[PDB]
Amino acid sequence: GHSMSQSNRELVVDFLSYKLSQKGYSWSQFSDVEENRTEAPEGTESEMETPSAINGNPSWHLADEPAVNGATGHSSSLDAREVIPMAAVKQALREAGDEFELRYRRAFSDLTSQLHITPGTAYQSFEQVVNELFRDGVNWGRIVAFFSFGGALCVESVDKEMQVLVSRIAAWMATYLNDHLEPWIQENGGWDTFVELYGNNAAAESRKGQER
Numbered sequence: 001g002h003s004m005s006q007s008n009r010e011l012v013v014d015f016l017s018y019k020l021s022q023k024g025y026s027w028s029q030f031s032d033v034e035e036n037r038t039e040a041p042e043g044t045e046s047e048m049e050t051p052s053a054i055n056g057n058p059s060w061h062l063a064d065e066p067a068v069n070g071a072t073g074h075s076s077s078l079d080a081r082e083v084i085p086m087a088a089v090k091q092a093l094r095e096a097g098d099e100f101e102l103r104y105r106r107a108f109s110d111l112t113s114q115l116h117i118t119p120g121t122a123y124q125s126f127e128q129v130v131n132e133l134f135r136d137g138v139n140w141g142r143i144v145a146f147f148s149f150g151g152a153l154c155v156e157s158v159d160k161e162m163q164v165l166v167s168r169i170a171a172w173m174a175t176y177l178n179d180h181l182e183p184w185i186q187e188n189g190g191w192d193t194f195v196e197l198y199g200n201n202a203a204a205e206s207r208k209g210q211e212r
Contacts (some may be wrong), residue, residue: 002178006189007086008116009174011191014090015097016151016170022062023155035164043120047162054112057155063105071099075201085192091190092199098143101148108152117153117165123172126150138184138195147173 017027030033048054074095075129080088115129116122130149137143150173157166177185196203 004085004182004186005178007084008089008177008191009171011089011093012170012174015093015147016154018094018098019063019101019151020154022066023059024062025059025154025158030165030167033167036167039164043118043122044162044164045119047160047165048116048118051113054116054118054156054160055110055187057112057154059159060106060108060152063067063102063120065105065207069099069102071095073201074099078205079200080195080202081207082198085190085195088195089098089191091202093144094199095201096198097144097147100144101151106152108179109190112153115153117156117169122165126172127176131171137162140197146176157196 013030020027068074077093078090079090082088109128115126117126130146133145133149137146140211150169153169154166
């Protein structure tokens with residue numbers, strides 16, 4: 001709870017909704033909130049019945065097939081006018097985040113049963129499987145593999161009826177940064193520097209003057 005704990009949490013749900021647009025997932029369950037109230041305490045354990053279930057999804061192949069983009073400018077929505085690394089990193093993590101997982105589409109199959117997302121201790125098992133490819137997460141464009149890793153299990157939410165795991169999979173992904181994963185991030189200037197580094201498409205306009 002410093003100053004980037006809740007600011008770096010909104011940008012995680014931004015690219016998440018852009019990737020669930022091609023899949024066909026309804027984000028109305030996250031806005032209403034009915035799985036984190038009186039549905040299941042700490043998490044549901046009636047979802048995991050067999051390991052031969054969470055490893056296949058009929059909506060895990062929609063990215064490069066339905067009109068693929070070769071990065072022409074995703075930061076054309078203009079969201080860096082709000083200032084602060086929260087709403088400004090919305091399009092910054094879209095031209096390098098949504099586009100990143102749009103090229104190779106989805107190479108994840110048995111990834112749902114690899115980390116296992118069902119109980120409340122699914123966070124510790126998630127940090128072990130993602131750490132295998134997080135050995136080179138020192139660059140601003142290499143840390144994107146961490147966000148796209150926890151954004152591929154959002155399709156198995158409506159398939160296994162576990163809408164409680166999709167509302168917390170993007171929550172612990174943002175808290176992990178504020179925990180101890182912010183060495184070179186806080187050294188430069190949070191995630192605000194990432195907006196003027198990768199997504200400089202909206203920064204090349206030099207704004208206009210909506211303040212004065």
